[PDB]
Structure formats: structure tokens, C-alpha cells
């Protein structure tokens, strides 16, 4: 289970361990914790709200 998700909108980190990404970035999802997901993009890791992405099947 390494799910892939595409950013529907850009999101800027609120905290030091939040992920930064731009609209259309493809994020690798490592963990799902209800409304917050942990993942990786552009070599960086962090948390982000799942509402900002859509799973790529």
C-alpha cells in the first residue's frame, strides 16, 4: 500500500511537519489518519488534509 494521490489545489504547510505542494502534484501517501494524511512529494515528507487530494487508481 503506497497509494498515489493528485493535488486538486495548492496547499502551504501550517506547521514544520506539514507537506507543501502545488495543484496537480502527485503525492505518495504513506499513512491515512482520518482527515490528515502523511505523504511525500518532491523528496519532502509531511502531513496534509486529505480534502486537498484525490486518489489516482
Amino acid at each position: 500500500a503506497l497509494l498515489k494521490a493528485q493535488a486538486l489545489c495548492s496547499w502551504t504547510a501550517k506547521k514544520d511537519n506539514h507537506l507543501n505542494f502545488s495543484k496537480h502534484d502527485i503525492i505518495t501517501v504513506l499513512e491515512q489518519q482520518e482527515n490528515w494524511w502523511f505523504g511525500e512529494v518532491h523528496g519532502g515528507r509531511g502531513w496534509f488534509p486529505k480534502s486537498y487530494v484525490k486518489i489516482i487508481p
Partner: peptide, 12 residues
């Protein structure tokens, strides 16, 4: 990855 501080700190 589950031992990274980024992960362990959690989203809040």
C-alpha cells in the same frame, strides 16, 4: 519513515 520526527509529531 515511521521513525521520522515529521511522522511521529503527528498533524496537530
Amino acid at each position: 519513515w515511521r521513525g521520522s520526527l515529521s511522522y511521529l509529531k503527528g498533524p496537530l
